[model samples]
Target: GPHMAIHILTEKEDHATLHISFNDLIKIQLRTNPSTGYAWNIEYPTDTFSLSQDTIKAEPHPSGMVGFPSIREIQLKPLKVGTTTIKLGYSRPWEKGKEPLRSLTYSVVIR
Candidate 1:
């Protein structure tokens, strides 16, 4: 039932360069704590990829309590052929003056 393999770029791959085909899907997952109002945002050329999903994923816990840390998942499909850098910022979207608590950069080459 599998069609194609998936590649998820995480924080560990920061500043890493990746080569991928246009048929393959690109995903990025980041660990975040939304309860603290800190989330990951993306900064890159929009035309390079077509975004299909962007959602916060909460893992199951024994207590089933709320306010736990969650995962930020982004799934997109490559379009044009070129090099692009995907910059991720972990910060509160509402706060404008403060800088991001953390940042990750990924260089991707689409062919």
Candidate 2:
């Protein structure tokens, strides 16, 4: 029987953008606390990679509370050889002209 291999990838909290081989896959988990009205949203997307916004579910609190800290697991697969930057902002969406609570940037270089 043809078997499929299962690989468990242990991800870390990396703040710097890194260079990767073309067509490589990268994982990211951004800290998010929705209860505090803080969220990270992608600014713009490029035509170079497969982009998907996946917010990981958070572990339950001992007090069985909601709106705990979660994470956004961003999966990126390069479509071509080049360099690009991914920018994310942590702030309330309805707020006007407010500086981002946290600005997370990643400079991705492929091939």
Candidate 3:
């Protein structure tokens, strides 16, 4: 079993405008093993967050490669002002009765 890292970027700071626009696209990255049918489940709070989908498949690396696949360049819309939390979980296709692996809780605040 391997671990995955998730990151989220924003355009604002604590209650400050920063003179930044919300039109920029937020990038999301995921690194996972390819040999297994592992998938990522992402959940965004509707009241404070919005995402494209609830779950996304982790594709395998190209032929001749010996490492897991990496998913990048995920575009996300601007978020509203409030506290938002992004939850992530990883699970395999097989292996019944096993709980999905969870990542550290990610939270953000906008003013």
TM-score of each: 0.86, 0.72, 0.54
lDDT of 2 by residue, 68-90 (tens): 65766766666787888777777
lDDT at residue 18 of model 2 (Cα atoms): 73
| Model 1 regions more than 4 Å off | 1-3, 61-67
Which candidate achieves the best lDDT against the true structure?
A: 1
- Best-to-worst ranking by TM-score: 1, 2, 3
Candidate 2: stretches off by over 4 Å? 1-15, 61-67
| CA RMSD of each candidate after superposition | 2.7, 4.9, 9.7
* Candidate 1 per-residue lDDT over residues 1-111, each given as its tens digit: 246557899989999998887777779988888778788989877889888789898855534665466878998788788888899999998897899999999988986
CA lDDT of each prediction against the hidden true structure: 0.84, 0.64, 0.48
Model 1, CA-based lDDT: 0.84
Q: Whose TM-score is higher: candidate 1's or candidate 3's? A: 1
Q: Which ten residues in a row have the lowest lDDT in candidate 1?
A: 59-68
Preferred candidate (TM-score higher): 2 or 3: 2
Q: Clash totals for all models, in order? A: 0, 0, 0
